């Protein structure tokens, strides 16, 4: 009586993606981002954008028939930060408030055993 999904959240510095798919991941159920739900570019990564996106997905998730989801949070990873930002955390909160049962929460950030050089250069970046 409980159909499961997979809520894949990608929390980038400049945007947050809330993507819900089947368990397999080949077929998408609903994809909503911060840019969907805000008027200004500066607020795409805002937590407020994230909660609105999650609520829209949660409503769409219900319409399909899926009642629970497995959360696979991730960040940009690679040569950049490995921890999801506040936007991803806010989206996870909204899904819990939406009423969709959360099955399991895992961090699947792309972590390189070895990586290429970063964009900053020697003197650093992120002034």
């Amino acid at each position: 009586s409980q159909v499961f999904g997979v809520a894949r959240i990608y929390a980038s510095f400049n945007d947050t993606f809330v993507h819900v798919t089947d368990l397999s991941g080949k077929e998408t159920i609903a994809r909503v981002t911060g840019g969907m739900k805000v008027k200004a570019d500066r607020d795409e990564s805002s937590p407020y954008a994230a909660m609105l996106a999650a609520q829209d997905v949660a409503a769409k998730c219900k319409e399909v028939g899926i009642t629970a989801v497995h959360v696979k949070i991730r960040a940009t990873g690679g040569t950049r930060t490995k921890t999801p930002g506040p936007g991803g955390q806010a989206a996870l909160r909204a899904l819990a408030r939406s009423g969709l049962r959360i099955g399991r929460i895992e961090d699947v950030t792309p972590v390189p055993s070895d990586s290429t050089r970063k964009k900053g250069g020697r003197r650093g970046r992120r002034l």
Partner: protein, 213 residues
């Protein structure tokens, strides 16, 4: 007798009834899900967990009305939503975040702010993400962030109105989204090599703006 004496106010029936318009009329019909969260606690934080948990379960079990327990065998803190008592759907996730803040290194009273409010987030990043520092260069960067007697870190905490846990090269910032952001640039500026004194000056400027607004 004393010697000083004088002298309140004032089963569904299995049938239907058909009304003048031909309509049927029937009798009235007879008049928060269980969820769990796992967070593992690392070794270095559990002794703080032991002596502090006398103050950690009360808010969770009372205000959030969560079902609290931890696994000694797996060394993890467990929270469950009790269907017959729990009322707030977001309490279970809220409790997990509060436990996580303590796990990352924040003070207990600092972590309680997560429970009290709904708009506090943890920002996390690493020193090499800003600039690849190694050997003594990395150590001096960490010292610069902390400052003598931790003064530089406290300056950021008070000015940007957040908290910072400086776990080696691992930085965690707790507060409101804008507030935690403000702290990051000050921390990052120190990493890039700005002297603490010049950074402290900018903290005073933003702090005044914070009070004005």
């Amino acid at each position: 007798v004393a010697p000083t004496a004088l002298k309140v106010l004032l089963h569904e029936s299995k049938t239907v009834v058909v009304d003048d318009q031909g309509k049927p009329r029937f009798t009235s019909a007879s008049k928060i899900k269980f969820e769990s969260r796992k967070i593992m606690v690392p070794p270095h934080r559990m002794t703080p967990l032991r002596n502090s948990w006398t103050k950690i379960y009360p808010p969770l079990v009372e205000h959030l009305k969560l079902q609290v327990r931890m696994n000694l065998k797996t060394k993890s803190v467990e929270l469950r939503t009790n269907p017959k008592f729990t009322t707030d759907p977001g309490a279970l996730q809220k409790g997990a975040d509060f436990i996580k803040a303590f796990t990352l290194g924040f003070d207990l009273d600092d972590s309680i702010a997560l429970l009290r409010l709904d708009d506090l987030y943890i920002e996390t990043f690493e020193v090499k993400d800003v600039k690849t520092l190694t050997g003594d260069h990395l150590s001096r960067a960490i010292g610069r962030i902390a400052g003598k007697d931790g003064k530089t870190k406290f300056a950021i905490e008070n000015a940007t109105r957040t908290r910072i846990v400086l776990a080696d090269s691992k930085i965690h910032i707790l507060g409101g989204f804008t507030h935690i952001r403000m702290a990051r640039e000050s921390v990052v500026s120190l990493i890039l090599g700005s002297p603490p004194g010049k950074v402290y000056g900018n903290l005073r400027t933003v702090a005044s703006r914070l009070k004005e607004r």
